[PDB]
Amino acid sequence: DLTXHLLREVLELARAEQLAQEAHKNRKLLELI
């Protein structure tokens, strides 16, 4: 009752964000180590 509402912009955005996110979480994944 809120999730299914999300996606869309996300499922889509991720498409345009399928480059930043990585480098993003990477900035942490590299520190998480």
Residue whose tokens read 């991720």: 14
**Dist. CA 9–CA 12, nearest whole Å:** 5
H-helix segments, 1-33: 9-17, 20-32
**Dist. CA 7–CA 9, nearest whole Å:** 6
Which approach determined this entry?
A: NMR
* Six-digit token string for 24: 């993003």
